[PDB]
Every structure is written in structure tokens, then in C-alpha cells.
Design a protein around this nucleic acid. Structure first.
Ligand SMILES: [Mg+2]
Ligand SMILES: [Mg+2]
Ligand SMILES: [Mg+2]
Ligand SMILES: [Mg+2]
Ligand SMILES: [Mg+2]
Ligand SMILES: [Mg+2]
Ligand SMILES: [Mg+2]
Ligand SMILES: [Mg+2]
Ligand SMILES: [Mg+2]
Ligand SMILES: [Mg+2]
Ligand SMILES: [Mg+2]
Ligand SMILES: [Mg+2]
Ligand SMILES: [Mg+2]
Ligand SMILES: [Mg+2]
Ligand SMILES: [Mg+2]
Ligand SMILES: [Mg+2]
Ligand SMILES: [Mg+2]
Ligand SMILES: [Mg+2]
Ligand SMILES: [Mg+2]
Ligand SMILES: [Mg+2]
Ligand SMILES: [Mg+2]
Ligand SMILES: [Mg+2]
Ligand SMILES: [Mg+2]
Ligand SMILES: [Mg+2]
Ligand SMILES: [Mg+2]
Ligand SMILES: [Mg+2]
Ligand SMILES: [Mg+2]
Ligand SMILES: [Mg+2]
Ligand SMILES: [Mg+2]
Ligand SMILES: [Mg+2]
Ligand SMILES: [Mg+2]
Ligand SMILES: [Mg+2]
Ligand SMILES: [Mg+2]
Ligand SMILES: [Mg+2]
Ligand SMILES: [Mg+2]
Lengths: 60, 67, 144, 185
RNA sequence: GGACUUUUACUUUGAAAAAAUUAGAGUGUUCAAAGCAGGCGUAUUGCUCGAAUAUAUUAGCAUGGAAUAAUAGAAUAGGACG
RNA sequence: GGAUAGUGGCCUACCAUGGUUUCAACGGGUAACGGGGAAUAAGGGUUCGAUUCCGGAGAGGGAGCCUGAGAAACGGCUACCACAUCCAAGGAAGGCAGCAGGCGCGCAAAUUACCCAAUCCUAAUUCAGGGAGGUAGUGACAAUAAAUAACGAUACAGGGCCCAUUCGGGUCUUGUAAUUGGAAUGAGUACAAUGUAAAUACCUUAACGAGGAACAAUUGGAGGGCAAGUCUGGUGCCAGCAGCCGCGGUAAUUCCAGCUCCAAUAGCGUAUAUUAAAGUUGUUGCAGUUAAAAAGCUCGUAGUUGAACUUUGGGCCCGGUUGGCCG
């Protein structure tokens, strides 16, 4: 069907999303320590068992 | 430190049977330096363009200073 | 026994029969006919670099409504003209015209990809500088 | 024109990329023996995989076959030597079984901790790579060393470094240099 | 040494067989991928284990088998032995 | 007969009419050098091999030849063809599919460095020569090992647990903590020795070298397949996503971001090809009434295939290798 359509709007939404800067955060350990940090988080102490389990829970 | 060593039956014996870079390391032999390896090659190739001793070719090219 | 000869001396027939019937295999057929070398815009190779002629407004297929930003490209080694897609958002701002671009396949083995009709290629680099990199802030587009 | 330098890869990778059960089972193993990689598990499974293959093939052969007896015993005696294989099950129908942890349990990473000396699997790691401890007077910085079980008795701190005693070292001697300089003349 | 022998397939064992690669034994390259080293002493005048084995399939050669499947024979007797 | 080192239609003379083919000759294609081998792991297979070893062929394209034991040689010559360089215009000269290096070509690939110390080769030869070869430089081709942190104390909090009439925190650690604590090491830097032909790195090792401004890990993804949010902001069938199914037209679990989370991690994404998944090429092992597929019918050569039957049964002997009960 149609081939020449308007090019004017190219980049529209990315150009108009309000920029918010990355916020400075504690540096996460790289390597074995991160695996460790996962292990103790995922298994040892756990967190919440509600209904099954949850990894990245929001306002629950 | 694991390593290797030799002991010759005399110092004359060593000097004749030893790699010449070792006698250098020790100081039993002087390092006589020469032109670059690719400098020598170039010298040879230049020499190849001359048949004979060539000092006779120095006079005939001196005649060119006239003509 | 339904067809195939079970005999101990029938090896020839059994070979020849398979040979014949391989041609009904799409992949086998392409490979021997040399379709890649003969047809197809790329020489059979993985990428091809070419030059931008015009910037197209190709409209999406149904049930989708959009305008997909694409460019008509003339491959250097060929002369073959090809329309390719310029991925992500903006990025058609990076291209312009008579520019050098690096085209790559769309993954579908020929076979144009999405709601984008007839476009079998996509842009990877422009002016040697890699659309991805341009798109974030990482690199900048060269002089001329 | 030189003979090719030969090489081989020491690991294999799981086909199903996301399997929640395998992942959990994987992490625990790492979190226990103190591994930074899934590859450090992948490697062992690959080594184990080839061993089981050899074992498998040997079993199909007739009992008391010359190849089977020779190669079979070698595999067994190798496995027993390092301490993966139990003395009680020596006959290789158990090498067919085995399992991963039996290999992991023998790493110098783990032996240094199992013996005390560390009191963490992670403290174990850092000590080893830091040019501490040893087998002989020979230092070993690789956590994967696979203690040979008759060398098990000789795991101890190095003749060098502190903890085996040498000299406190730059981080400590720095403070000792700040103690006598600030407080004294 | 003489005098003659119906033709094949299949299977067995063996000879002839480059190395590197593969499988694989031995050996603690600090581990490992590797390498083919090395290991012991009187470490002042030497002792010493190694550098295996397997695969190598069609064809050709050599040998054992005689089931399976072919081939040839004696009927115008122009048959067989002496 | 001639010719060759020599067999031979290799060539010539005379004579004859032969030679190959559906068991596929002849011809065509090959983005074809052959092989040892490579990739893919139930097996049977499939695909690949320009390229470290072996064999062959070539030296811009053809032909011809000198030398010699050996060449139809090309870092030898002669001629033609195509390139192409120097000049005083008369003439003369070149052949990188050797090492580096340049242009062109493209998706696609490194230094105009050092040395004969090793590995070996050649010569009249222990010595000379060797861009063979080694050395370093460039180098995320592929391959191996594996740093980016370890340990306490303390501040509430908890789950344990003995007691619970009821305050609870007490010593066994689970750790989330926005103040703390001294310990440790190489990444780098660097005397020195080691290393090396001489250097460089490595292995050693004085002096230095860690607290968040760091010596600060990435690359993709978070609707389904598929592991991880229905969080907040933005846009409003636009911009864009999306291998495939599908998202976006104003509360978007797919876009643009912030936060948080997942997977692999010194690596991870993409494109193209191939292999496994594929019993969707099927010998093992497919399907053909209606899903793709039995020729309208019968004859029939090539091909494949093809009933049963011919020394079986019984007797005697010899000596091997496992395994038992015993040693
Ligand atoms: Mg020279
Ligand atoms: Mg001369
Ligand atoms: Mg058809
Ligand atoms: Mg649809
Ligand atoms: Mg157009
Ligand atoms: Mg072209
Ligand atoms: Mg055989
Ligand atoms: Mg005729
Ligand atoms: Mg044919
Ligand atoms: Mg070709
Ligand atoms: Mg080849
Ligand atoms: Mg081939
Ligand atoms: Mg080619
Ligand atoms: Mg021609
Ligand atoms: Mg020639
Ligand atoms: Mg040349
Ligand atoms: Mg030559
Ligand atoms: Mg003149
Ligand atoms: Mg060159
Ligand atoms: Mg490259
Ligand atoms: Mg060179
Ligand atoms: Mg870092
Ligand atoms: Mg820091
Ligand atoms: Mg990210
Ligand atoms: Mg899920
Ligand atoms: Mg929203
Ligand atoms: Mg998001
Ligand atoms: Mg991957
Ligand atoms: Mg079969
Ligand atoms: Mg089917
Ligand atoms: Mg129908
Ligand atoms: Mg039908
Ligand atoms: Mg019919
Ligand atoms: Mg017919
Ligand atoms: Mg029959």
C-alpha cells in the first residue's frame, strides 16, 4: 500500500518524555559476593511466603 | 630456582666449546658490534652490481666530470 | 511392505530415490540451486553495505496502524536496490541521504518480519558509527 | 609450519535456559561451596558427564574383558585417589552413580574451610588467592585445586605471609610506622 | 618335482599399515587447557621408570568356517572311473 | 618403424572396424584441489575441510627452451597477448599466489621492527648464508586458570529455645542496618636478581600501592514461549515495540524512562550459515480412503525379488578357560 508517509514525527515520544536523572545508589558487589548476596536473600532468611513466594513485589 | 650448569676442565676448554654470547655475559669475550642485519644485506646487494675490484670504475666515472 | 524395496541388493534404488526426494526439501533445494548467490540482494553473505537513496514512510500492515521508518538503499557490490528498516525511536534523524549504511538480515531467513510490508533488512551502522551507539549518547556522527 | 597447539573446553551448558528448579538447585551449590560462576558448576557436570560415559561403555563389555579391567580399574583408582570415590564402593557401578557434590567437596576451596583455618567458604577463597597457605612448601592459589586426599594432611598456612608467620606485611607495618612516628620522635 | 583343479557371495582371524587429531594409560604443568615430561640420591664427579594401548570399516592380500543365497554337472550319452 | 630414459596410438605408414553406454555412457553444473581430518554427541546419520602434516597444481595469461643428475624453472631465458616503469625520443628495463608494506575489492583479516640463540637446510663447509625458522609488535579468532572483597564489634529487630504468674531480651546466630574497627592482597608502580641473541613479559622479590570521589562489570531481558513488577512518570493505533503470539486509539503487566527485579557474567547481544530438536527425507524409521500423495486400464524389457528337497543321527578319544567345594 502506501509508501511515502510523513517523516515529521520521527523520534516524537523519546524527545518529549521528561528526563529524570539516574539516582546515586550503593555499589553492588561484583562476582562471588553477588552470588552470595543472592543465595542468602533467596534461600537462607527468605522474605515472604504469601500464597507462594514473590521476587520483585510492589505495593502488596 | 631450578637451573643448569657446566664446568669445563680448563678455561681454554670453555672458551672453545662455549656459546659466544655466554663468554660475553661473563666478560671472557668482547662483543664486537657490526652494522644492522638489514644494513649488511643492503651492502651485499650494492656490492653485487660491481664486477671486478671496482676502483677502476671510479676513474671511468671521473671521466664523466668532463663530458 | 508398502513401497521401499527391502532387498539386499536394492541399495541403488534406495539411494536414487532419496536423491530425487531431497528436492522436495526447501533448504536442500536452495542450497544446490545456489539461490543465495543468484537471487537475494546480499551475495549470500551476512551483511552488505550500501547507499541511501531516499527515506521512505512505509505504512504498517493490519491490524496495525503506524508509519514504519525505512530507507531505500543501493548495495555497493551489486547495484541491487533494497529498502531497509531503521530501528528504534528517531534514528531516521541519524541517516539523511547519500549516506553509507550497513544492512543486516531481519532474522526470518528472507521473509519480511513484522507488520512492515516487503522489508527484509535493517540498518546497523551509518557513517561507520553504529546506530545503537548514536541512539544513546555513546558516539557521534562524523564530519561529512 | 609448527605442530598445532591442541586445546579443549572444560565446560558444557544446559539446553533448557530457564528452568526454575535447576536454577535454585544451582545457586545453593554455589552459595555453599563459594563459587562465583554457574560455570564452576557447569565444568564439574561436564567432567562428571564424560566419566559416566566411559563407565557406561565399559559396562556393556563382557566381564573380565582386558580393556574393561585395565581402564576400569584406572578410572576407579584415579577417582579413589583424590577422594571422590568411597573405599567401600570400588567397583564402578557407583562411579556410574556418583554425583556433583562429591567432586565439589574435594576442592582446596572447601578443604581449607572444612579443616577450620577459614571459618567461611568465602574467607577460604580470599585466603587462597592472596598467596596464603600451601600443600608442601608449595603455595596454591587456585580454589579448584582438588586435594588428593593423601595431601589432605599437609594443608596449612604458608612459610611466608602472616598466619604462618613471616612478617606482618605492608598494611600492618604501615600502622606500626604510624605508631612510632606520631607518638615518638 | 610332476600331473590337474566348476565359479562366487557372507563370516572369522591375521599380516601390511605416518604423524598430529580422536579414545585412552602413566606423570601433581602451583590448578587447568597443555607438555612428554620426570622421579630418586652420597644433591663432590649418579641412580632410575618412561615416551603405552585402542580405532584405522570399502578394496587388495593371508587364514579358519561350510549354515544362509547363488553358479556349474549326465538325457540324441559326445557321460564316469581302468 | 620412428621417437622416449623406457612400456604404450606417444607419433607415422600399411591394414582392419572396432571402443563406451539405463549396472547411466556422452554432455552440463560445481560460489570442486584430493586426503589425514572438522562440527553436531542414544544409535543410524547430516554438514564441512581455501587453511600447521601428506600428495597434486601454479607463479599476470599462453607457448617455447637453455643449463643440468633433476626444471618444460619463472626471485632462468625467448616470443606473442595483457599490464606497465625510466629517457636527453636514440633506446632501456619489470613480474610479491616469498617477508613486511601500499592500492583496489569488499561484511571480512596485523609490523615497511629484531636475530641466526634454538629448530633445521645448503655450500669448497665446525666458521659463511638462511624474511626457511625463531623473537618481539598488532591481536576479546578460538582455548585454560579466575580479582572486583574477607573478618569482627555495636545500635535497635527477628526467628530459636528454657520460663511465661506476665514485663522479656540473652548467647546459640539468621541477617537488614546511612556512626564504627583494625586486619589481607594484587591491578599497577618499581631497586635488584632472574629471564633473552639483545631486549619485553612471565616466575621471584626490596621501596611504594583500598575505604565508596572507589582500583566504582557488563550485556540483554522482566505479558506468553521464558527466569524476573499489573510499581510511578510520559505518550495516546502517534512515537515505537514485537523471531513467533501479539502490544499502543488517556488508569499501556510489551513503547519512552525512573525505581526495583531476573539470566549469563570478562564477557554478553545481533546478522548469515550449518548441526541437534526432525520418525518434517524415514536403511534403522514417515505418510498416501476423507489432511499433501496409488498412473484410466492391462501387457511388458531393464531393475529388484523368488516354494520345498541332497551327511543327518549315534559312538569313542585328546587337551584347553572360567567358576565352584576345598589350600
Ligand atoms: Mg648478512
Ligand atoms: Mg662478490
Ligand atoms: Mg513438486
Ligand atoms: Mg496475525
Ligand atoms: Mg521506492
Ligand atoms: Mg565484484
Ligand atoms: Mg580385519
Ligand atoms: Mg567405423
Ligand atoms: Mg543419471
Ligand atoms: Mg575452484
Ligand atoms: Mg585441503
Ligand atoms: Mg569437499
Ligand atoms: Mg577459493
Ligand atoms: Mg586462452
Ligand atoms: Mg615458466
Ligand atoms: Mg617474487
Ligand atoms: Mg622458486
Ligand atoms: Mg641522446
Ligand atoms: Mg606481501
Ligand atoms: Mg576479524
Ligand atoms: Mg622473518
Ligand atoms: Mg573493575
Ligand atoms: Mg576502594
Ligand atoms: Mg541494565
Ligand atoms: Mg515467568
Ligand atoms: Mg504506565
Ligand atoms: Mg520498563
Ligand atoms: Mg549463550
Ligand atoms: Mg538396518
Ligand atoms: Mg509426515
Ligand atoms: Mg478435497
Ligand atoms: Mg486429497
Ligand atoms: Mg488406482
Ligand atoms: Mg508407463
Ligand atoms: Mg530358497
Amino acid at each position: 500500500a502506501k509508501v511515502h508517509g510523513s517523516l515529521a514525527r520521527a523520534g516524537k515520544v523519546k524527545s518529549q518524555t521528561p528526563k529524570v536523572e539516574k539516582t546515586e545508589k550503593p555499589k553492588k558487589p561484583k562476582g562471588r559476593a553477588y552470588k552470595r548476596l543472592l543465595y542468602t536473600r533467596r534461600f537462607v532468611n527468605v522474605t515472604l511466603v504469601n500464597g507462594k513466594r514473590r521476587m520483585n513485589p510492589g505495593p502488596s | 630456582s631450578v637451573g643448569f650448569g657446566l664446568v669445563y676442565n680448563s678455561v681454554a676448554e670453555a672458551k672453545k666449546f662455549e656459546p659466544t654470547y655466554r663468554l660475553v655475559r661473563y666478560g671472557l669475550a668482547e662483543k664486537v658490534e657490526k652494522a644492522s642485519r638489514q644494513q649488511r644485506k643492503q651492502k651485499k646487494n650494492r656490492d653485487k652490481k660491481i664486477f671486478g675490484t671496482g676502483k677502476r670504475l671510479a676513474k671511468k666515472v671521473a671521466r664523466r666530470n668532463a663530458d | 511392505g508398502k513401497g521401499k524395496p527391502r532387498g539386499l541388493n536394492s541399495a541403488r534404488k534406495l539411494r536414487v530415490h532419496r536423491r530425487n526426494n531431497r528436492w522436495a526439501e526447501n533448504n536442500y533445494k536452495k542450497r544446490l540451486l545456489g539461490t543465495a548467490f543468484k537471487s537475494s540482494p546480499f551475495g549470500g553473505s551476512s551483511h552488505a553495505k550500501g547507499i541511501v537513496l531516499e527515506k521512505l514512510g512505509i505504512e504498517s500492515k493490519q491490524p496495525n496502524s503506524a508509519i514504519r521508518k525505512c530507507v531505500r538503499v543501493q548495495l555497493i557490490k551489486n547495484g541491487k536496490k533494497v529498502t531497509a528498516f531503521v530501528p528504534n525511536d528517531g534514528c531516521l534523524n541519524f541517516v539523511d541521504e547519500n549516506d553509507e549504511v550497513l544492512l543486516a538480515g531481519f532474522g526470518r531467513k528472507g521473509k519480511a518480519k513484522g507488520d512492515i510490508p516487503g522489508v527484509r533488512f535493517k540498518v546497523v551502522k551509518v557513517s561507520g558509527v553504529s546506530l545503537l551507539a548514536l541512539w544513546k549518547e555513546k558516539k557521534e556522527k562524523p564530519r561529512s | 609450519p609448527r605442530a598445532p597447539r591442541t586445546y579443549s573446553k572444560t565446560y558444557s551448558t544446559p539446553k533448557r535456559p530457564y528452568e526454575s528448579s535447576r536454577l535454585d538447585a544451582e545457586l545453593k551449590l554455589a552459595g555453599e561451596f563459594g563459587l562465583k560462576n554457574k560455570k564452576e558448576i557447569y565444568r564439574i557436570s561436564f567432567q562428571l558427564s564424560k566419566i559416566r560415559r566411559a563407565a557406561r561403555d565399559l559396562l556393556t563389555r563382557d566381564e573380565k574383558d582386558p580393556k574393561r579391567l585395565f581402564e576400569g580399574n584406572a578410572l576407579i583408582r584415579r577417582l579413589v585417589r583424590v577422594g571422590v570415590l568411597s573405599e567401600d564402593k570400588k567397583k564402578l557401578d557407583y562411579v556410574l552413580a556418583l554425583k556433583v557434590e562429591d567432586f565439589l567437596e574435594r576442592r582446596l576451596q572447601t578443604q581449607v574451610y572444612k579443616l577450620g583455618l577459614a571459618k567461611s567458604v568465602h574467607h577460604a577463597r580470599v585466603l587462597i588467592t592472596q598467596r596464603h597457605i600451601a600443600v608442601g612448601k608449595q603455595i596454591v592459589n587456585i580454589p579448584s585445586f582438588m586435594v588428593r586426599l593423601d595431601s589432605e594432611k599437609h594443608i596449612d598456612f604458608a612459610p611466608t605471609s602472616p598466619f604462618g608467620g613471616a612478617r606482618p606485611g605492608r598494611v600492618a607495618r604501615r600502622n606500626a610506622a604510624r605508631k612510632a612516628e606520631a607518638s615518638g620522635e
